[PDB]
Subunit: 306 residues, 3 copies
């Protein structure tokens, strides 16, 4: 049974493909880098999708248990998220197939949250200790991904609806998450998921810039500011995050890292904080590069699949 969180791998790679794509007209060679990342992300996604279909057929009770868990359900949102991102990649080659994937992932994520996120409001299942960064995946990241994918298809006003859902959902959840983190020491087995705390502001601004035609305005700058604050906090926390050692869970950070890269291309194009933009783009690529190297290492020892 494939661990569902592994979908974070094609997610990070696919998002990074899209970042490089947005540099092609400033530096032509970026398109080849983008295409390579995009093909690799897509191949990995295909494999993981097939593996998850196998899980649904032969390990369905394992899926049922993860679905009904008030903590583990969130990782399932990675499936429609990555479906949309692979759609966004494939758009450069086949807009028809791209659009099919984008709608499948959009309907899928919205149905998923409507069924499961709402159900939590019945009480008595979710506990204080369930207040984990992973909740951002169905609640926030999935909506931002729909927003930017729909904008790609030309549905800007519908994209703004999904954008708003994600942005307000973020602001509404984060207050209780950070209070929980302050009071309760997140157990080491979950600590890598602190990397998801990097994501919201960067995924938000990336989606926003996708829908608003790359206009770097006051809202975009505001979001970058909080994003960088969180980055600095997580950098200071990193030795604690990895107290028990480096692990594959660190792909959690790739969501925010790839969105820092993507948004940086727009800041750069807009001639806003170009120095910060260069740093952000280089930093995020180096860190995802390290994730890839660590992953090849783990594969190189049979430490990847359970």
């Amino acid at each position: 049974p494939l661990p569902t969180g592994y979908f974070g791998i094609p997610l990070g790679l696919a998002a990074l493909s899209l970042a490089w794509f947005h540099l092609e007209n400033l530096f032509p060679a970026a398109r080849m880098v983008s295409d390579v990342l995009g093909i690799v992300a897509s191949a990995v996604w295909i494999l993981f999708i097939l593996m998850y279909a196998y899980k649904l057929r032969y390990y369905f009770e394992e899926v049922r248990a993860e679905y009904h868990s008030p903590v583990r359900f969130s990782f399932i949102a990675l499936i429609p998220i990555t479906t949309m991102l692979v759609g966004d990649i494939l758009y450069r080659w086949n807009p028809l197939i791209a659009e099919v994937l984008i709608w499948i992932g959009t309907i899928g994520q919205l149905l998923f949250s409507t069924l499961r996120v709402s159900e939590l409001w019945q009480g008595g299942v979710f506990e204080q200790k369930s207040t984990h960064p992973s909740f951002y995946l169905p609640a926030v990241a999935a909506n931002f991904t729909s927003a930017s994918s729909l904008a790609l298809l030309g549905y800007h006003d519908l994209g703004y609806l999904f954008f708003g859902a994600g942005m307000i959902a973020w602001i509404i959840f984060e207050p209780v998450l950070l209070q929980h983190l302050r009071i309760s020491s997140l157990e080491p087995q979950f600590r890598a998921t602190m990397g998801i705390v990097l994501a919201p502001a960067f995924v938000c601004v990336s989606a926003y810039l996708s829908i608003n035609h790359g206009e770097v305005d006051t809202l975009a700058k505001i979001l970058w500011g909080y994003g960088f604050l969180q980055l600095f906090f997580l950098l200071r926390l990193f030795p604690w995050i990895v107290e028990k050692g480096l692990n594959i869970g660190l792909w959690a950070f790739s969501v925010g890292l790839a969105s820092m890269a993507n948004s940086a291309t727009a800041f750069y194009h807009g001639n806003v904080l170009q120095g910060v933009s260069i740093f952000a783009f280089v930093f995020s690529n180096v860190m995802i590069g390290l994730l890839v190297l660590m992953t090849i290492y783990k594969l190189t020892k049979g430490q990847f699949f359970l």
Copy 2:
């Protein structure tokens, strides 16, 4: 002694009158529908106001107890809210009387929150279990209603102050409400009030569009997106909300429903998401229509007044 929550009835009807009013120049017949709803809402308001004056005179200790309750105090805000909405209706016929009611309701709600909402910060009375959707009434809905009523009178900048108070108060309360709902199963006797969770985004965007001259902009679209997310969540939850049967408390939903209708008229006028707008307007009218039919039924059996 009239249950104070019954003011939600003229509230929902009055708000719906105003929605139809905003369609009159697209479809002239809308004005008659608006006038009928408005007269009915006003008549019901007059009756309930007289009944509440009777309560204050002969059942004052019942009023005192509801006022000092950290949960029940909120429903009292329905009185100045409905006072303002009836003012907004009457403006079409007598702007002088309308303006008197609007100021009475505005001063009244602001005094009410200043006295009671602040007092909660003294601690030791409000408990975790007091964290109920009804808190949105004094904290959020009342401010939005002042904002739009003041805009009607031409006081746009003052309206923005009340708008800001409501919007930020919303974003500041909702995080702790949804966390509470996730952890603690709201008792069935209060569950109909989950309908108030529909209200914030729709009441917010309705007030916003009233003050900003109906300009459907990025903020408006963002608010609609979160509003519809909450709608989908509450639709999924509805069988649970009414587990113990349909009751008059479901008028809780009318605040959000009527504001969905009102905001839809502006989206439609602005040629933004006209299909969504038509659905929203029809849906909200049908649901409030069902509330009315259920209410006539309850009246038809002597199940209305305590």
Copy 3:
């Protein structure tokens, strides 16, 4: 050992100097009032800085303890905040020295939060009872002060980053603070710090207007509205806040008061709510004047320094 909170005194005076500065071209005499307040604030800052250097040298364990406290650490942020404000004052006379102080305070506050605010997310030190208004100092006020100081130096886009960090940090913390205040009665020994609750919206709008060239727009009006709501709440609460008597801790209120004054100058210049602006400016000056008189009284009896 100087109590670290006393830095709130030069903070309030310095911010008030800057408010008067912004009136000089409407009323020339304002410049002398500004210069006098600015010189006094700077002199007091110099003294307190020297006293705190003495504390670091001879009472270092007292500094260590305040730093590691999940509640008391916050007051240390007053040091870089006041450093920046004194920089802003001195800019009128020596932009080079001003710029040095502004960068020292900016780097200092950002390093301070990066080290200490993030550390809280490790859990097990901060407790529910640590949820105090003072947390706004490192988390929110320091970022807004960097934003406006950087804008003064011409670094508007960097200022927007700090602005965004402060604004989102505010919205993210306040929900849990107000819920805590509702449930837990803040002990009298801390109650004066309720005055910090006045600060966020006013400090936010002041910083915003500093970066956006004094344009009084929808966001500015929205922030003023919530700011005034909080003012009304705190006015109603004031007898409770001072239940155990007036004390020097009431300088807590000066952060919000001085920012109400500053923002009022911009609303007035912009011909938005000029009546409200006059009230706000006069009110805040009178209240800070009373703080000064009470402080001279306490000094006049040897009740100032521990």
